[PDB]
Amino acid sequence: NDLRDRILSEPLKHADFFNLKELFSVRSLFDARVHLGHKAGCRHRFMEPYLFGSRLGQDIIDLEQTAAHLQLALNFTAHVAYREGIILFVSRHRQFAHLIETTARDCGEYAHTRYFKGGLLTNAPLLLGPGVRLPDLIIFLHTLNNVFEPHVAVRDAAKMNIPTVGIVDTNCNPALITYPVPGNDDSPPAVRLFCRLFQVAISRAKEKRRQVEALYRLQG
Amino acid sequence: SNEDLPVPMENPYKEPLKKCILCEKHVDYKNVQLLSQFISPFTGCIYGRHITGLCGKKQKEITKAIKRAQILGFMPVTYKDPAYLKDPKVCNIKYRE
Amino acid sequence: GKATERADAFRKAKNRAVHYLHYIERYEDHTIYHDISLKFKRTHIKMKKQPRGYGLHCHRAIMTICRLIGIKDLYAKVSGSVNMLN
């Protein structure tokens, strides 16, 4: 038991424990059309600090702050996977649902790209089973549903005290998202880049957890 | 210290505003040929903005000129003059289908 | 908690009150940090910080709420509406 707390305390003492800086850069985000957002009329009021400007009606997201938020979001996602946490990729968008399902299957985490039932996260002991374990992290690839309204899961995670890492567009509300990352969720290159980043972060976290366990076995 | 920052300047891509057909023109009460183009040949009604397509001043000026000419004895009220009936069509209303 | 039977309503209220819990910052565990003047929908509440020897001279419901919270000394006045829920 004494050696178990050391494993959990090891990554908390280092800033870049999993070396996630090499995964992306400003140019990598720029090449994926991340900086591009909706028109000025679709701009949310809370998205003003997360915007670089407006290019003839279309607002532009500042990739400097995009990457600044993305570093923390990826570090938080990697730590949850390292600490054996349940990660649920929730996204309601009928274009990349198969890609999200495949990325989650490859990660070994859980996914939800279909219609979200009402009492799913709240009335869990009746919707999922007698006794279930709530997801320890919720990842949003598309904050808005098909009705252009905030998703149920972003509110339910805040209600049930579940951290949420979410890609927020210019028309999204980052108020309830624990780790919002301003970007574009409608570009296929951007969504593929985000899926690959969240895939490699989880893969590295699990591989490093396995290596740390192997070292712990040799410790005694 | 960055020289690539945007500058708060005027929009260079500002398109010119659309002009009415009589923009920067002189409307008169004596040009019955001009006044007849905005009236119905069969009834004599004065076409509205959605039919003519004139910006705010010229529609009212044409209406006033038509009303003045119909009473001064220059243009018939009940019908359009067959002499000016063969004028080019400026209105956007189609009757015969 | 609302139910056809009184016992069922009591049980539902007891079971559903735990899910909604606030944390109250209590100065020295006896009073509040500063005087609070709040205006709800139609109820105005004016609460003033009180010393050790002035214990719960408030409305009969605010006194019970503060006793359950842990506040031992407080003065409060309610003006306007007297609706219990508000």
Partner: protein
């Protein structure tokens, strides 16, 4: 059990104060991660109130001195013969070549707009691009 209140504050605060009071006797695994790497903004609920009156958003439009030459190029020649390729990161367009010629002509000590325009238009013929003026 916990606190299902949304508008009161943030999840970190609502999880920390519960343990501080002693209701939540089990510390969540994500609380340590939040303490180690807090986000830039605390996840507190903010109501999107509508903006009325003379108040306007603080977002500023994106414009450069290059746009003042691009508008002139598009007014006369319009879209260039070479179609734009958005896939290529380092793609240079016909108007990009025109503005690159224009800045060098400005550096050459020419202040007249006609001199800066017609000279670039004729110099593009040296490279060999076709300009289609719109009448």
């Amino acid at each position: 059990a916990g606190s299902r209140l949304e508008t009161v504050g943030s999840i970190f605060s609502r999880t920390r104060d519960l343990i501080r009071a002693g209701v939540l006797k089990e510390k969540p695994l994500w609380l340590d991660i939040y303490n180690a790497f807090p986000p830039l903004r605390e996840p507190v609920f903010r109501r999107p109130r509508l903006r009325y009156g003379k108040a306007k958003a603080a977002v500023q439009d994106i414009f450069y001195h290059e746009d003042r030459i691009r508008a002139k190029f598009y007014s006369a020649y319009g879209s260039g013969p070479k179609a734009f390729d958005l896939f290529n990161p380092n793609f240079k367009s016909t108007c990009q070549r025109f503005v690159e010629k224009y800045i060098e002509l400005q550096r050459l000590g020419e202040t007249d707009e006609e001199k800066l325009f017609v000279e670039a238009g004729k110099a593009l013929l040296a490279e060999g691009v076709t300009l289609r003026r719109v009448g």
